[PDB]
Write an enzyme that holds these catalytic residues in place. Structure first.
Site, PDB file in Angstrom:
ATOM      1  N   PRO B   3       1.036  -1.139  -0.130  1.00  0.00           N
ATOM      2  CA  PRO B   3      -0.040   0.029  -0.230  1.00  0.00           C
ATOM      3  C   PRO B   3       1.011   0.876  -0.330  1.00  0.00           C
ATOM      4  CG  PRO B   3       0.376  -0.993   2.151  1.00  0.00           C
ATOM      5  CD  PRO B   3       0.668  -1.795   1.212  1.00  0.00           C
ATOM      6  N   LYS B  35      -0.070  -6.400   6.734  1.00  0.00           N
ATOM      7  CA  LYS B  35       0.756  -5.797   5.725  1.00  0.00           C
ATOM      8  C   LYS B  35       2.203  -5.708   6.449  1.00  0.00           C
ATOM      9  CE  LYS B  35      -0.689  -7.397   1.971  1.00  0.00           C
ATOM     10  NZ  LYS B  35      -1.969  -7.224   2.339  1.00  0.00           N
ATOM     11  N   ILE B  67      -4.502  -2.515  -3.017  1.00  0.00           N
ATOM     12  CA  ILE B  67      -4.341  -3.448  -3.860  1.00  0.00           C
ATOM     13  C   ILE B  67      -5.833  -4.217  -3.343  1.00  0.00           C
ATOM     14  CG2 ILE B  67      -4.272  -5.164  -5.265  1.00  0.00           C
ATOM     15  CD1 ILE B  67      -1.489  -4.328  -6.418  1.00  0.00           C
TER      16      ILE B  67
END
Lengths: 112, 115, 115
Positions: B3, B35, B67
């Protein structure tokens, strides 16, 4: 709430930049039908810009609003007029419209 | 799937302050999004002319692109954690503006290739 | 169908390097996208605080907007060709991050009119 993000290779003074965000912000409020409270304006000057092969004075703009074709034509004309009235040529002015959703927007630590 | 956080603000930061900010804001995005801490791209532009609600008082505009991985629940958590960073560093929470831009795999590039 | 390339990087460029860069990168966009240079817009902001993968080493963030004309097939060629410019100009290819954002005709403006 609408947002206007501006990049230009012109160099503005602090007084010119402060006046510009005020005038451009007021333009967005009138054309979009939102109060001035909801308007966010960003101006980055002195950035290297090349449009049509030329680094002549130019401006790139993106307009994000929480929720058309009719308004975008009206918005394009009113924003360009400010630049043409401040030393720019209307064929060097570039606008992109990106409408967004409520859940994809944040303010005061919360979404809508 | 890394990201990206793009930050524009009219506040003036020192070089050390900018360095701490990208680390801290990046670590916040990584935790909330699930993440790894390293896998995050952060952009910080200070000293930009900003006018929000008619005032050019200290304010910040932010865009978070990932995404996928940006449902309504995660966005509220990210909005809150990012705003907390700013309110802890002299900002007012009502001068902080965040936009979420979910995107597609084929529309994202890294190391010269899309996903 | 004008394309737009927006670049943020923490590298420091002289004015001549930026001027050469917008020309070279714009020509790449024209080449990959199949459009004449007349319709191509490039913006380059250097010296912005960037942290990618925990490191504030030289890195670059890019967004490429085109009115349609962006399938995954082009996105990979564009990603590769754009990355090659950076790896040939002192950057590391795994520090280059690209976003493709196709927009619709009604969502694009120029000379006071949409498409």
């Amino acid at each position: 709430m609408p947002a206007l993000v501006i990049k230009t290779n012109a160099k503005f003074t602090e007084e010119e930049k402060s006046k510009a965000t005020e005038e451009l912000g007021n333009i967005v409020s009138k054309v979009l039908g939102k109060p001035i409270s909801y308007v966010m304006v960003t101006l980055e000057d002195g950035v290297a810009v090349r449009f049509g092969g030329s680094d002549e004075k130019a401006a790139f703009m993106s307009l994000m609003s929480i929720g058309n074709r009719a308004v975008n034509k009206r918005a394009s004309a009113a924003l360009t007029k400010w630049f043409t009235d401040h030393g720019f040529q209307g064929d060097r002015i570039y606008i992109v419209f990106n409408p967004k959703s409520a859940e994809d927007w944040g303010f005061n630590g919360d979404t809508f």
